[PDB]
Design a protein around this ligand. Structure first.
Ligand SMILES: [Cl-]
Ligand SMILES: [Cl-]
Ligand code: NA
Length: 129
């Protein structure tokens, strides 16, 4: 599923992401925009053989099992395919664990490079929330 900007914002808010660990809703929407272009089905292969999955491009080296990343962990305890569903619950739940692991949202390179230090609130402007 390809989410609309305000549609995704509302879904993230409902799942408790707004100001989760101090990150306002605009941050999460901005990261989803530049990680996946709001597409739950996005996949990307990394040089080390791991793969990133779903709307927040969660990586198989640490966080999910895709059966093809040798010597990897599965810290959200889910198959990576679960992260591609049109229901974002698994992606959200896993993201909460990632952002809690000490490095905040710097774990997402696109957030660090394209959202951090910008007016992120613009990403939820105009939305009925
Ligand atoms: Cl915001
Ligand atoms: Cl933080
Ligand atoms: Na894994």
């Amino acid at each position: 599923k390809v989410f609309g900007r305000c549609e995704l914002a509302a879904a993230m808010k409902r799942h408790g992401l707004d100001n989760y660990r101090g990150y306002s809703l605009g941050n999460w929407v901005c990261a989803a925009k530049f990680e996946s272009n709001f597409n739950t089905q996005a996949t990307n292969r990394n040089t080390d053989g791991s793969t990133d999955y779903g709307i927040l491009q969660i990586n198989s080296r640490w966080w999910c099992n895709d059966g093809r990343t040798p010597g990897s962990r599965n810290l959200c305890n889910i198959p990576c395919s679960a992260l591609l569903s049109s229901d974002i619950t698994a992606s959200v739940n896993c993201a909460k664990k990632i952002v809690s692991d000490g490095n905040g949202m710097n774990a997402w390179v696109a957030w660090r490079n394209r959202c951090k230090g910008t007016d992120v609130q613009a990403w939820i402007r105009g939305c009925r929330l």
